[PDB]
Design a protein around this ligand. Sequence first.
Ligand SMILES: O=C1C[C@]2(CCN(S(=O)(=O)NC3CCN(CCNC(=O)c4cccc(-c5cn6cc(C(=O)NC7CCC7)ccc6n5)c4)CC3)C2)C(=O)N1
Ligand SMILES: [Zn+2]
Lengths: 366, 138
Amino acid sequence: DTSLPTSHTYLGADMEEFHGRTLHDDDSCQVIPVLPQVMMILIPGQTLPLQLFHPQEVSMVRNLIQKDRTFAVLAYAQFGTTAEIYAYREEQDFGIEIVKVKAIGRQRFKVLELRTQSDGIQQAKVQILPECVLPSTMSAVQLESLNKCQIFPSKPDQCSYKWWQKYQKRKFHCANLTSWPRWLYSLYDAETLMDRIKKQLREWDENLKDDSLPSNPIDFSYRVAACLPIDDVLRIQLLKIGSAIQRLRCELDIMNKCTSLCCKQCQETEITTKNEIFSLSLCGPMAAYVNPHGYVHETLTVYKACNLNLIGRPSTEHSWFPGYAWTVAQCKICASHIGWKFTATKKDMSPQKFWGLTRSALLPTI
Amino acid sequence: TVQVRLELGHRAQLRKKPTTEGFTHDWMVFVRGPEQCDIQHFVEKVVFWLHDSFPKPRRVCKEPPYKVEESGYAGFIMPIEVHFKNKEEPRKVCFTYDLFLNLEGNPPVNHLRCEKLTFNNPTTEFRYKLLRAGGVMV
Ligand SMILES: O=C1C[C@]2(CCN(S(=O)(=O)NC3CCN(CCNC(=O)c4cccc(-c5cn6cc(C(=O)NC7CCC7)ccc6n5)c4)CC3)C2)C(=O)N1
Ligand SMILES: [Zn+2]
């Protein structure tokens, strides 16, 4: 099953859920709390689980659940992402009022000012960045008489050269009215770029369903960026870009260029290659999970790993993937904590093994 | 003169399922500094010394958070070294954190210790990094 990992059941069974949506209009100045223990570059639509133990962060999250259920995660800063709380639970753990929460990245923003507070709730003066939505590139170059031939009968040879050649010929027929060919405009079309990205994802996951990916270019681009094995600078660059088409083109370029991931400590030892990536979760090949002590790691799932060594015996005490037992794993050259190996508890389960590597210890290479 | 706060801490909880090795508690020691300050501005790295009974007695954390999550059966005295980007003494600060675990079937142990540190002859860029971290010039 691929739905279990996103449930984050390892945290707890029951947690109060808030299905409401809190949105901030664009180019609007807000004052938002800042979480001190989150350095992650939260992308919109990415799930952030947290287990707060600090005496003051408990109070701040209590105030948040009281009002607007939203906080900020700075892109450690000049940019950051707002996170909206959606699951909540209290417990008495470690002898402290511990608060287990789950939130979702919602909006990007630019930092205008960071002012501390008496209680310690660092307030950020936040500017909500916009999502630049452009019309079809043929919108300015179009014939009214052909407006009928813009909606196509179906999307069933099929899903191959035939349909896409017809799509290019029909939706970009007016390229001849300009100095540029049709195949050029094909490079700045949301649909074609999304289809190519979907082809790449299917190459990664042979069991990929079309319904699992958003049909909206903005959401699709954000999900793709969230699931790529990339570094922090490229994450910042992708967040900065406000146009969906530009983000999709950048993602395609990165996917073409990226080849392997090395040890961020050694810097010359390869652990895995992009072709071995696979998705065990609807969220994607990479997802964020909290350890028993509340800290967050971005784990990427692969069939195989290179130059890895394991310590201990597989256990299911706090496994992020139900039905699987984890063993701590590290790069044998330096022993740095690269991730874990998950093995099947049962025998009639597919797959019988895989690996999960934390992005914080992986350096992409070109 | 520059006067900067620091906060060390640890937590320890009885293991509901004792392991084959014989460990009965899970403990985590963390160095985070004061409230809402990116220590990385002036700390280059942190060194955690663990009991030699543990494997890899010396742990190093080069970026925050600075921590050592482990499991065991007894406490000890844990040395900690915080090394700064300082160009002159103090270039490094040593603490002797009393790492203790919760026995007697009491609730899990949680400890926080706050300390104050002094730097002298700060430069313009030194003051700039300290203010990036929120350090106060006295
Ligand atoms: O898939 C997933 C994964 C997770 C679930 C888990 N996570 S995690 O890994 O990130 N977090 C933590 C990371 C750390 N892990 C343990 C690390 N240590 C080891 O392995 C290890 C191996 C070999 C030997 C020893 C050892 C300890 N000793 C203590 C003593 C002692 O007491 N001496 C006293 C006398 C005075 C002092 C003596 C000897 C000794 N030898 C330790 C635990 C998990 C995320 C999830 O949520 N989902
Ligand atoms: Zn290594």
